[PDB]
mmCIF file of C-alpha atoms in Angstrom:
data_model
loop_
_atom_site.group_PDB
_atom_site.id
_atom_site.type_symbol
_atom_site.label_atom_id
_atom_site.label_comp_id
_atom_site.label_asym_id
_atom_site.label_seq_id
_atom_site.Cartn_x
_atom_site.Cartn_y
_atom_site.Cartn_z
ATOM 1 C CA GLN A 6 150.951 -195.456 112.856
ATOM 2 C CA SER A 7 147.977 -193.332 114.144
ATOM 3 C CA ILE A 8 144.167 -194.698 113.009
ATOM 4 C CA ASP A 9 143.038 -190.980 115.186
ATOM 5 C CA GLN A 10 145.415 -188.741 113.658
ATOM 6 C CA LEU A 11 144.894 -190.677 109.719
ATOM 7 C CA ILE A 12 140.797 -190.398 110.347
ATOM 8 C CA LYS A 13 141.119 -186.753 111.305
ATOM 9 C CA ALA A 14 143.798 -186.294 107.816
ATOM 10 C CA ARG A 15 140.249 -188.051 105.884
ATOM 11 C CA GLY A 16 138.361 -185.192 107.524
ATOM 12 C CA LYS A 17 136.528 -186.908 110.681
ATOM 13 C CA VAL A 18 136.515 -185.515 114.398
ATOM 14 C CA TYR A 19 137.972 -188.897 115.952
ATOM 15 C CA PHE A 20 139.283 -192.677 116.538
ATOM 16 C CA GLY A 21 137.580 -193.190 120.025
ATOM 17 C CA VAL A 22 138.113 -195.784 122.572
ATOM 18 C CA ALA A 23 136.077 -197.187 125.975
ATOM 19 C CA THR A 24 138.642 -197.028 129.179
ATOM 20 C CA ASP A 25 138.547 -196.208 132.854
ATOM 21 C CA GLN A 26 140.974 -196.119 135.776
ATOM 22 C CA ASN A 27 141.640 -199.838 135.785
ATOM 23 C CA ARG A 28 142.769 -199.629 132.501
ATOM 24 C CA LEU A 29 144.580 -196.711 132.423
ATOM 25 C CA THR A 30 146.930 -197.841 135.324
ATOM 26 C CA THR A 31 147.566 -201.238 134.208
ATOM 27 C CA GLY A 32 149.287 -202.944 131.215
ATOM 28 C CA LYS A 33 149.976 -200.731 128.484
ATOM 29 C CA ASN A 34 146.856 -199.517 127.471
ATOM 30 C CA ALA A 35 147.362 -196.049 128.406
ATOM 31 C CA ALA A 36 150.491 -195.433 126.370
ATOM 32 C CA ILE A 37 148.200 -197.181 123.229
ATOM 33 C CA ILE A 38 145.455 -194.605 124.066
ATOM 34 C CA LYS A 39 147.959 -191.873 124.156
ATOM 35 C CA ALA A 40 149.267 -192.817 120.540
ATOM 36 C CA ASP A 41 146.512 -194.011 118.822
ATOM 37 C CA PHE A 42 143.697 -192.989 119.952
ATOM 38 C CA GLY A 43 141.943 -189.133 119.812
ATOM 39 C CA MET A 44 138.998 -189.616 122.586
ATOM 40 C CA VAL A 45 137.988 -191.413 125.508
ATOM 41 C CA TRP A 46 134.813 -192.633 126.720
ATOM 42 C CA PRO A 47 134.364 -194.071 130.027
ATOM 43 C CA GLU A 48 132.873 -197.519 130.588
ATOM 44 C CA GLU A 49 131.529 -197.391 134.035
ATOM 45 C CA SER A 50 132.264 -194.726 136.064
ATOM 46 C CA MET A 51 129.810 -191.951 135.055
ATOM 47 C CA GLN A 52 127.153 -194.821 135.143
ATOM 48 C CA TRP A 53 124.222 -194.314 137.410
ATOM 49 C CA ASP A 54 124.978 -196.884 140.406
ATOM 50 C CA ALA A 55 128.862 -195.353 140.294
ATOM 51 C CA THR A 56 128.542 -191.809 140.373
ATOM 52 C CA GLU A 57 124.406 -191.759 142.428
ATOM 53 C CA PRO A 58 124.555 -194.819 144.773
ATOM 54 C CA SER A 59 122.163 -193.245 147.168
ATOM 55 C CA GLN A 60 119.756 -190.243 146.347
ATOM 56 C CA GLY A 61 121.740 -186.980 146.036
ATOM 57 C CA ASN A 62 124.764 -188.787 147.234
ATOM 58 C CA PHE A 63 127.283 -188.246 144.547
ATOM 59 C CA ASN A 64 130.349 -190.264 143.892
ATOM 60 C CA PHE A 65 132.521 -188.940 141.472
ATOM 61 C CA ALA A 66 136.410 -190.143 142.232
ATOM 62 C CA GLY A 67 136.512 -192.551 138.950
ATOM 63 C CA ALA A 68 135.162 -189.746 136.502
ATOM 64 C CA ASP A 69 137.165 -186.909 137.445
ATOM 65 C CA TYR A 70 140.623 -189.168 136.942
ATOM 66 C CA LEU A 71 139.283 -189.694 133.652
ATOM 67 C CA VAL A 72 137.814 -186.545 132.800
ATOM 68 C CA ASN A 73 141.418 -184.923 134.363
ATOM 69 C CA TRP A 74 143.758 -187.685 132.486
ATOM 70 C CA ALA A 75 141.957 -187.105 128.514
ATOM 71 C CA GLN A 76 142.817 -183.228 129.637
ATOM 72 C CA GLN A 77 146.065 -183.882 130.605
ATOM 73 C CA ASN A 78 146.931 -185.881 127.419
ATOM 74 C CA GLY A 79 145.011 -183.505 124.881
ATOM 75 C CA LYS A 80 141.824 -186.047 124.012
ATOM 76 C CA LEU A 81 137.840 -185.700 123.699
ATOM 77 C CA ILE A 82 135.875 -186.913 126.027
ATOM 78 C CA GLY A 83 132.292 -188.831 125.720
ATOM 79 C CA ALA A 84 130.082 -189.918 128.235
ATOM 80 C CA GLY A 85 127.330 -191.574 129.428
ATOM 81 C CA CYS A 86 124.736 -193.077 129.969
ATOM 82 C CA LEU A 87 122.748 -190.186 131.705
ATOM 83 C CA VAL A 88 119.405 -192.836 131.439
ATOM 84 C CA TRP A 89 119.026 -196.271 131.022
ATOM 85 C CA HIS A 90 118.320 -199.155 131.981
ATOM 86 C CA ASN A 91 121.529 -200.636 133.058
ATOM 87 C CA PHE A 92 123.385 -199.512 135.709
ATOM 88 C CA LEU A 93 120.215 -198.714 137.621
ATOM 89 C CA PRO A 94 120.569 -198.594 141.499
ATOM 90 C CA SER A 95 117.274 -200.078 142.766
ATOM 91 C CA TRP A 96 116.387 -197.151 144.996
ATOM 92 C CA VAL A 97 116.319 -195.854 141.477
ATOM 93 C CA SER A 98 113.937 -198.517 139.827
ATOM 94 C CA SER A 99 111.928 -198.725 142.909
ATOM 95 C CA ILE A 100 110.002 -195.479 142.315
ATOM 96 C CA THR A 101 106.733 -194.826 141.586
ATOM 97 C CA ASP A 102 105.662 -191.141 141.651
ATOM 98 C CA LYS A 103 105.964 -189.700 138.813
ATOM 99 C CA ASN A 104 106.554 -186.280 140.267
ATOM 100 C CA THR A 105 109.175 -187.714 142.102
ATOM 101 C CA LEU A 106 111.081 -189.598 139.233
ATOM 102 C CA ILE A 107 110.998 -187.099 136.647
ATOM 103 C CA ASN A 108 113.007 -184.827 139.628
ATOM 104 C CA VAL A 109 115.165 -187.498 140.638
ATOM 105 C CA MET A 110 116.158 -187.950 136.724
ATOM 106 C CA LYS A 111 116.464 -184.024 136.227
ATOM 107 C CA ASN A 112 118.817 -183.873 139.555
ATOM 108 C CA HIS A 113 120.822 -186.812 137.979
ATOM 109 C CA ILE A 114 121.625 -185.364 134.241
ATOM 110 C CA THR A 115 121.913 -181.901 135.510
ATOM 111 C CA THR A 116 124.287 -182.574 138.430
ATOM 112 C CA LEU A 117 126.415 -185.170 136.250
ATOM 113 C CA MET A 118 126.668 -182.543 133.191
ATOM 114 C CA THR A 119 127.236 -179.254 135.289
ATOM 115 C CA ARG A 120 130.049 -180.740 137.080
ATOM 116 C CA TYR A 121 131.949 -181.259 133.603
ATOM 117 C CA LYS A 122 130.553 -178.159 132.273
ATOM 118 C CA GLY A 123 132.627 -177.125 128.315
ATOM 119 C CA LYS A 124 134.832 -180.233 129.469
ATOM 120 C CA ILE A 125 132.468 -183.323 127.568
ATOM 121 C CA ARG A 126 131.880 -183.546 124.051
ATOM 122 C CA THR A 127 129.289 -186.441 123.568
ATOM 123 C CA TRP A 128 126.843 -187.139 126.689
ATOM 124 C CA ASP A 129 124.810 -189.949 125.698
ATOM 125 C CA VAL A 130 121.781 -188.886 127.449
ATOM 126 C CA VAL A 131 119.475 -191.593 126.580
ATOM 127 C CA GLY A 132 120.260 -195.191 125.536
ATOM 128 C CA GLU A 133 118.397 -198.504 124.740
ATOM 129 C CA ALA A 134 114.898 -196.977 124.239
ATOM 130 C CA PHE A 135 113.657 -198.775 122.274
ATOM 131 C CA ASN A 136 112.591 -202.988 121.772
ATOM 132 C CA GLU A 137 113.353 -204.802 119.176
ATOM 133 C CA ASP A 138 110.217 -204.754 117.098
ATOM 134 C CA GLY A 139 110.203 -200.805 117.417
ATOM 135 C CA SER A 140 108.181 -200.113 120.263
ATOM 136 C CA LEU A 141 109.772 -198.216 123.012
ATOM 137 C CA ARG A 142 111.152 -200.429 125.730
ATOM 138 C CA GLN A 143 109.037 -200.589 129.198
ATOM 139 C CA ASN A 144 111.506 -199.041 131.785
ATOM 140 C CA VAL A 145 111.079 -197.485 134.988
ATOM 141 C CA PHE A 146 111.291 -194.043 133.314
ATOM 142 C CA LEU A 147 108.476 -195.463 130.415
ATOM 143 C CA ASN A 148 106.059 -197.009 133.415
ATOM 144 C CA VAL A 149 106.246 -194.432 135.320
ATOM 145 C CA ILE A 150 107.008 -190.962 133.492
ATOM 146 C CA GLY A 151 105.637 -192.454 130.000
ATOM 147 C CA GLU A 152 107.162 -191.857 126.570
ATOM 148 C CA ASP A 153 107.617 -187.658 127.454
ATOM 149 C CA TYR A 154 110.724 -189.368 129.808
ATOM 150 C CA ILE A 155 113.197 -188.833 126.179
ATOM 151 C CA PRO A 156 112.307 -185.243 125.511
ATOM 152 C CA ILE A 157 112.228 -184.031 129.299
ATOM 153 C CA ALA A 158 116.264 -186.119 129.462
ATOM 154 C CA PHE A 159 117.220 -184.231 126.699
ATOM 155 C CA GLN A 160 115.447 -180.943 127.444
ATOM 156 C CA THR A 161 117.242 -180.957 130.527
ATOM 157 C CA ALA A 162 120.454 -181.997 129.139
ATOM 158 C CA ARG A 163 120.587 -178.781 126.910
ATOM 159 C CA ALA A 164 120.003 -175.977 130.058
ATOM 160 C CA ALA A 165 122.472 -178.421 131.953
ATOM 161 C CA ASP A 166 125.370 -177.509 129.136
ATOM 162 C CA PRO A 167 124.737 -175.842 125.577
ATOM 163 C CA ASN A 168 128.345 -176.760 124.217
ATOM 164 C CA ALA A 169 128.058 -180.835 124.779
ATOM 165 C CA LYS A 170 126.710 -182.705 121.649
ATOM 166 C CA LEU A 171 123.827 -184.618 123.003
ATOM 167 C CA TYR A 172 123.220 -188.065 121.926
ATOM 168 C CA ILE A 173 120.547 -190.921 122.025
ATOM 169 C CA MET A 174 122.191 -194.958 121.547
ATOM 170 C CA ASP A 175 120.772 -198.109 120.818
ATOM 171 C CA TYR A 176 122.181 -201.225 119.563
ATOM 172 C CA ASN A 177 121.209 -203.660 116.670
ATOM 173 C CA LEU A 178 120.519 -200.723 114.715
ATOM 174 C CA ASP A 179 122.882 -202.559 112.139
ATOM 175 C CA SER A 180 120.266 -203.776 109.546
ATOM 176 C CA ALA A 181 118.817 -201.289 107.156
ATOM 177 C CA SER A 182 115.282 -203.694 106.922
ATOM 178 C CA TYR A 183 115.532 -204.224 110.498
ATOM 179 C CA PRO A 184 112.244 -202.852 112.217
ATOM 180 C CA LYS A 185 114.522 -201.359 115.235
ATOM 181 C CA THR A 186 116.530 -199.329 113.132
ATOM 182 C CA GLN A 187 113.930 -197.962 110.728
ATOM 183 C CA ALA A 188 111.656 -196.833 114.307
ATOM 184 C CA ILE A 189 114.305 -194.982 115.844
ATOM 185 C CA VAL A 190 114.799 -193.072 112.698
ATOM 186 C CA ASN A 191 111.162 -192.509 112.252
ATOM 187 C CA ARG A 192 110.404 -191.412 116.211
ATOM 188 C CA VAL A 193 113.899 -189.194 115.962
ATOM 189 C CA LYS A 194 112.384 -187.047 112.941
ATOM 190 C CA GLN A 195 109.421 -186.550 114.693
ATOM 191 C CA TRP A 196 111.401 -185.421 117.894
ATOM 192 C CA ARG A 197 113.418 -183.017 116.318
ATOM 193 C CA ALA A 198 110.452 -181.864 114.582
ATOM 194 C CA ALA A 199 109.196 -181.061 117.836
ATOM 195 C CA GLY A 200 112.023 -178.704 119.223
ATOM 196 C CA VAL A 201 113.862 -181.831 120.980
ATOM 197 C CA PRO A 202 117.729 -180.837 121.341
ATOM 198 C CA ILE A 203 119.002 -184.858 119.874
ATOM 199 C CA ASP A 204 122.145 -183.810 118.502
ATOM 200 C CA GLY A 205 122.965 -187.074 117.587
ATOM 201 C CA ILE A 206 122.198 -191.148 117.146
ATOM 202 C CA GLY A 207 124.979 -193.733 118.036
ATOM 203 C CA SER A 208 125.293 -196.789 116.923
ATOM 204 C CA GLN A 209 125.643 -199.676 119.722
ATOM 205 C CA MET A 210 127.724 -201.502 117.276
ATOM 206 C CA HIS A 211 128.577 -205.089 119.614
ATOM 207 C CA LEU A 212 129.090 -206.779 115.811
ATOM 208 C CA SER A 213 128.770 -210.785 114.804
ATOM 209 C CA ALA A 214 131.160 -211.812 112.174
ATOM 210 C CA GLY A 215 130.096 -210.615 108.820
ATOM 211 C CA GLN A 216 127.685 -207.938 109.876
ATOM 212 C CA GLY A 217 130.166 -204.982 108.870
ATOM 213 C CA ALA A 218 128.644 -205.368 105.319
ATOM 214 C CA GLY A 219 125.141 -204.393 106.487
ATOM 215 C CA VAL A 220 126.717 -201.428 108.328
ATOM 216 C CA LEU A 221 127.273 -199.877 104.455
ATOM 217 C CA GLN A 222 123.732 -199.626 104.203
ATOM 218 C CA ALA A 223 122.417 -198.839 108.021
ATOM 219 C CA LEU A 224 124.861 -196.140 108.870
ATOM 220 C CA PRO A 225 123.010 -194.253 106.325
ATOM 221 C CA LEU A 226 119.328 -194.874 107.088
ATOM 222 C CA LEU A 227 120.420 -193.615 110.543
ATOM 223 C CA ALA A 228 121.785 -190.834 108.569
ATOM 224 C CA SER A 229 118.435 -190.151 107.193
ATOM 225 C CA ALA A 230 116.774 -189.023 110.455
ATOM 226 C CA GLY A 231 118.434 -185.273 110.722
ATOM 227 C CA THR A 232 120.041 -185.495 113.373
ATOM 228 C CA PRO A 233 123.619 -182.940 113.182
ATOM 229 C CA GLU A 234 125.634 -186.363 113.996
ATOM 230 C CA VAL A 235 125.685 -189.987 113.982
ATOM 231 C CA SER A 236 128.462 -191.862 115.488
ATOM 232 C CA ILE A 237 129.538 -195.364 116.178
ATOM 233 C CA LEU A 238 130.516 -196.960 119.372
ATOM 234 C CA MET A 239 130.669 -199.932 121.335
ATOM 235 C CA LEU A 240 132.335 -201.097 118.638
ATOM 236 C CA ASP A 241 133.954 -204.747 118.360
ATOM 237 C CA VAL A 242 133.097 -207.409 116.131
ATOM 238 C CA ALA A 243 133.488 -211.250 116.725
ATOM 239 C CA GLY A 244 136.972 -213.187 115.080
ATOM 240 C CA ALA A 245 137.964 -209.267 114.315
ATOM 241 C CA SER A 246 138.335 -209.823 110.910
ATOM 242 C CA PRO A 247 139.669 -207.301 108.831
ATOM 243 C CA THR A 248 136.448 -207.200 106.149
ATOM 244 C CA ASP A 249 134.416 -206.009 108.797
ATOM 245 C CA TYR A 250 136.611 -203.781 111.111
ATOM 246 C CA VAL A 251 137.393 -202.441 106.862
ATOM 247 C CA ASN A 252 133.557 -202.298 106.021
ATOM 248 C CA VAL A 253 133.186 -200.473 109.225
ATOM 249 C CA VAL A 254 134.951 -197.850 108.858
ATOM 250 C CA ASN A 255 134.029 -197.242 105.242
ATOM 251 C CA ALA A 256 130.700 -196.884 106.294
ATOM 252 C CA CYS A 257 131.820 -193.805 108.726
ATOM 253 C CA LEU A 258 133.928 -192.710 105.625
ATOM 254 C CA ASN A 259 130.802 -192.800 103.523
ATOM 255 C CA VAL A 260 128.251 -191.016 105.738
ATOM 256 C CA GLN A 261 129.270 -187.206 106.486
ATOM 257 C CA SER A 262 127.360 -186.690 109.649
ATOM 258 C CA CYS A 263 129.311 -189.426 110.785
ATOM 259 C CA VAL A 264 131.530 -187.694 112.939
ATOM 260 C CA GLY A 265 133.780 -190.520 113.925
ATOM 261 C CA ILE A 266 134.097 -194.194 116.003
ATOM 262 C CA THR A 267 134.883 -195.258 119.315
ATOM 263 C CA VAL A 268 136.272 -198.793 119.709
ATOM 264 C CA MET A 269 135.035 -201.632 122.816
ATOM 265 C CA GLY A 270 138.341 -201.130 124.786
ATOM 266 C CA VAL A 271 141.922 -201.581 123.514
ATOM 267 C CA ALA A 272 143.048 -205.541 124.421
ATOM 268 C CA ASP A 273 140.909 -208.710 123.943
ATOM 269 C CA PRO A 274 141.742 -210.301 127.115
ATOM 270 C CA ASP A 275 140.007 -207.003 128.646
ATOM 271 C CA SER A 276 136.990 -207.471 126.946
ATOM 272 C CA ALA A 277 133.684 -208.769 128.194
ATOM 273 C CA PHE A 278 133.797 -210.828 124.838
ATOM 274 C CA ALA A 279 137.509 -211.954 125.332
ATOM 275 C CA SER A 280 136.352 -215.856 124.333
ATOM 276 C CA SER A 281 135.393 -214.190 120.676
ATOM 277 C CA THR A 282 138.780 -212.170 120.402
ATOM 278 C CA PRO A 283 137.084 -208.765 118.772
ATOM 279 C CA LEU A 284 139.591 -205.827 119.123
ATOM 280 C CA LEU A 285 142.452 -204.711 118.134
ATOM 281 C CA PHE A 286 144.897 -205.433 120.069
ATOM 282 C CA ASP A 287 145.979 -208.612 121.026
ATOM 283 C CA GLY A 288 146.269 -210.453 124.289
ATOM 284 C CA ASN A 289 150.177 -209.300 124.065
ATOM 285 C CA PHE A 290 149.291 -205.316 123.020
ATOM 286 C CA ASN A 291 149.907 -206.293 120.058
ATOM 287 C CA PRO A 292 148.037 -204.508 116.889
ATOM 288 C CA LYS A 293 146.161 -207.263 115.081
ATOM 289 C CA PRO A 294 145.517 -207.659 111.331
ATOM 290 C CA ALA A 295 142.268 -205.842 111.435
ATOM 291 C CA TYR A 296 144.258 -202.716 113.410
ATOM 292 C CA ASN A 297 147.056 -202.436 110.504
ATOM 293 C CA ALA A 298 144.213 -202.672 107.369
ATOM 294 C CA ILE A 299 142.561 -199.752 108.907
ATOM 295 C CA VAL A 300 145.572 -197.751 108.871
ATOM 296 C CA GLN A 301 145.879 -199.020 105.208
ATOM 297 C CA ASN A 302 142.842 -198.453 104.041
ATOM 298 C CA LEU A 303 142.724 -194.556 105.810
ATOM 299 C CA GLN A 304 145.921 -194.104 103.847
#
């Protein structure tokens, strides 16, 4: 039973999964993604250090492979992250001149999005921009450009591909009482009021056991920012309890603007957190109790 087909039947857009050429060419990953998922999300091949390892010298081979595989198999594509502090080459973080960095950032955004224009459903434009107390995270963009780097990034992305949905994303947005959750809602409200084209908030749900229950209140709070969409991505759950996974799915179903869920890989041994067995398929590529519980809940 395909959880993507079942979640579409309930009115959502997709159940997706993070992957890349390394996974699609080994084991049973390709067969499972074909059968059970409706959207793919490159784990590393679209990040800055992979795509622009030297300034103006782009490398698209891995990203091209993923996009072509998705189109051939009828899958939606989400891609990112265009601007964040992870996967960032030193040549970028060493820039100290504001105009130089604005132009570098705009060029990185425009080049990636133009190459795949019309083919990408969702771009993660800005990621992990907030500290745990709700202040903005001090990365090179904030240090050199200032808080305007976020509006500039989204305005540039919107001009490059008006078809794509443009997201901001962060982690630890899983509790409605946590300062970070309330801060991103307030800031996104203000940005949208100023005309900034933020289409979505993506919640990076790398969850500890038992945190699914709190998502039932956190996700509606994120939806109150008034973006056209919200999504769940990078989802995994330590221990992979059915209770946590079903709670996360029910939160999605309860929030009308939540378009879908993307899990953080297929099989446990390929997770960065493999020792906590946090995914929906085990090391033999067999569906786990959590997978069957999602199927049963959606039916």
